[PDB]
Structure 1
């Protein structure tokens, strides 16, 4: 494999959907042949405009099948013209491994209203036998993998290729490296008795709350000293770093007070990144104060995710003294928890 004076890299983009679909009390299919059990529509993050659904016929779709289980995949919404894909089904057995896996070798085309699948997927007696355990506790578990192909793209790595090195846009690093130098700072800025020499122009540029506060009767007299006491300097310097550099790398260690400051300052990106930090840290012991901070900071998504956590761990989260304190102090949170866990779930 010698060195090539020109190379090209043809990239057919592929994205993968992964799907589980469980039917309870399957022996009560409750009807005869031809009937269909649609599944709820499902997708992935990108592009999320292509929505798929499952059609499963418990009895035979055709007179040739009859004693056969048949599944199809059906595409309900396509923003493009057509989408080419390969599907692979497999029944999960009692333990959970993939059995009876059947796939289509062809990348079938897909239009809205067009469905493809396996009519002769698995024999009805083979399913209804208990010895193979293909129907554990009358629960039918189907796992489908969907592979969607997109356009190929060529990056054209032929050499000599404008051989000067091109830096990216330098608004962020140039502004970030000016803070330690502390140049072009027209005014002073002290928080909690500690001096942080910065200036009001770029802060007014990069936070509309603060600029609207600046132009209204403070820059005339108290421009030089501004009273900030809602945060410690360790949170204030992190927020100033986020304002200038554009990122807050020290996130996990102080995600909570950074979220509180971001709720105070209506910084939605800071709020959602601290929420992303704290979502993985959901635990039984911390769920109550997590809910309290979410309610105080009006993070509806975090409130919903913590509600789901309480739904999944309701056996032990309730008896915690933290949740008891949340009960005694926050009746509304418990009322909303009851509403979500009652109306939505059951």
Structure 2
């Protein structure tokens, strides 16, 4: 029993009629072929309008039913224009049980005053033979089953199917909102006279610099009026937002000195991400100052990429004035630049 997404249940409702009909002293039927005996109309609790009746021929309709007692079901009243049904007929024996059952398998279409049935229902000699017991006390008791169908309906029950979804982990932006809200602020950051604000423990969690100079016994003196003199405040806002939020929205316009700030405060993920940002900015002329910044701020992964860049594009790097400034100002970086070029990637001569 596998599980499916959608059930559908198209049922047809059948209503059953129950009816027995007895005739006393039937042997004096008083007529040859041609006479009919219709009983009273009957109905069940199905709109109280489906009126059925039973027609019997004691002798028969015609010459083919000379030795047959004919039996026919007739519909007289119905609200709908067309009603179809399947029907069932039977007689009772001496002891009362069912006898002599025949069936019409089609669901015949019934109209107002339209008949169906078994013309050769039972042999007249077989019925009137008293040894068969088909005429107990000279009484003829019948039984009838009317099975009426009507139009089908649909339910289409879509079962339930979903698991109750959990929301996303909003731990990043929900504490990023705390940056702008500044609720229950513990310290006010000071940079260039302009006043930011922050807490203590959350800053000590992320950075080694703050997790030194918040516990070397300067809580009552430095937390109140903590002073920072190096980083420009527009850089400082973004690196502070990276400490709380964990994201940097506008890194690409300010990717240069944020690496310096990241190396200043030992913020390793910021340093790696600034190396990532300055990796995809290596034009043919500006690699010298990129390598200078990488050397002064210990960006080794960016340093190796810059050295590879100057090795591959050095046919045009040395024409620019940046290389000459590098030669004049920084003697020791040219050692590593020549070293990776010398012991790699062109000793085939």
Q: TM-score, normalised by structure 2?
A: 0.53
Determine whether 1:291 maps to 2:263.
no
What whole-Å deviation, never above 9, does each CA across 1:175-199 have from its counterpart, x for those lacking one? 1111221111022221111111222
Task: Pick which of 111-120 and 194-203 moved more.
Answer: 111-120
Task: Pick which of 260-269 and 199-208 moved more.
Answer: 199-208
What whole-Å deviation, never above 9, does each CA across 1:195-215 have from its counterpart, x for those lacking one? 112222211222232122111
Query: Cα offset for 1:164?
Result: 3.2
Task: Look up the match of 2:151.
Answer: 151
Sort the Cα spacing of 1:67 and 1:193 in 2 relative to 1 into closer, same or farther, 3 A: farther
Query: Cα offset for 1:170?
Result: 2.7
Task: Pick which of 253-262 and 210-219 moved more.
Answer: 210-219
Query: Cα offset for 1:345?
Result: 2.6
Distance 2:29 2:183 in 1: 75
Task: Look up the match of 2:269.
Answer: 269
Sort the Cα spacing of 1:12 and 1:307 in 2 relative to 1 into closer, same or farther, 3 A: farther
Given that residues 203 and 243 in structure 2 are in contact (C-alpha distance below 8 angstroms), is that contact kept between their aligned partners in structure 1?
A: yes
Query: Cα offset for 1:61?
Result: 101
Sort the Cα spacing of 1:3 and 1:71 in 2 relative to 1 into closer, same or farther, 3 A: same
Query: Cα offset for 1:172?
Result: 1.4
What pairs up with 1:144-293 in 2 under 5 angstroms?
Answer: 160=160, 162-293=162-293
Distance 1:111 1:118 in 2: 18
Which sections of structure 1, spanning at least 5 residues, go unmatched? Answer: none
Sort the Cα spacing of 1:37 and 1:261 in 2 relative to 1 into closer, same or farther, 3 A: farther
Given that residues 93 and 135 in structure 1 are in contact (C-alpha distance below 8 angstroms), is that contact kept between their aligned partners in structure 2?
A: yes
Given that residues 5 and 161 in structure 2 are in contact (C-alpha distance below 8 angstroms), is that contact kept between their aligned partners in structure 1?
A: no
Which sections of structure 2, spanning at least 5 residues, go unmatched? Answer: none
Sort the Cα spacing of 1:171 and 1:142 in 2 relative to 1 into closer, same or farther, 3 A: farther
What whole-Å deviation, never above 9, does each CA across 1:253-280 have from its counterpart, x for those lacking one? 0011111100111111111111111111
- Flag as ranges the 4+ runs of structure 1 deviating above 4 A: 1-4, 6-163
Task: Pick which of 279-288 and 121-130 moved more.
Answer: 121-130
Task: Look up the match of 1:342.
Answer: 342
What whole-Å deviation, never above 9, does each CA across 1:39-58 have from its counterpart, x for those lacking one? 99999999999999999999
Sort the Cα spacing of 1:198 and 1:324 in 2 relative to 1 into closer, same or farther, 3 A: same
What pairs up with 1:99-138 in 2 under 5 angstroms?
Answer: none
Task: Pick which of 309-318 and 32-41 moved more.
Answer: 32-41
How many aligned residue pairs are there?
A: 346
Given that residues 41 and 52 in structure 1 are in contact (C-alpha distance below 8 angstroms), is that contact kept between their aligned partners in structure 2?
A: yes
Which is greater in Rg?
A: 2
Task: Look up the match of 2:94.
Answer: 94
Distance 1:343 1:63 in 2: 122
Distance 2:307 2:247 in 1: 29
Task: Pick which of 199-208 and 52-61 moved more.
Answer: 52-61
Given that residues 189 and 199 in structure 1 are in contact (C-alpha distance below 8 angstroms), is that contact kept between their aligned partners in structure 2?
A: no
Query: Cα offset for 1:122?
Result: 92
Distance 1:156 1:341 in 2: 74
Task: Pick which of 87-96 and 199-208 moved more.
Answer: 87-96
Sort the Cα spacing of 1:56 and 1:2 in 2 relative to 1 into closer, same or farther, 3 A: same
Given that residues 36 and 58 in structure 2 are in contact (C-alpha distance below 8 angstroms), is that contact kept between their aligned partners in structure 1?
A: yes
Task: Pick which of 138-147 and 210-219 moved more.
Answer: 138-147
Sort the Cα spacing of 1:230 and 1:88 in 2 relative to 1 into closer, same or farther, 3 A: farther
What whole-Å deviation, never above 9, does each CA across 1:273-313 have from its counterpart, x for those lacking one? 11111111101121110110011111112111111111111
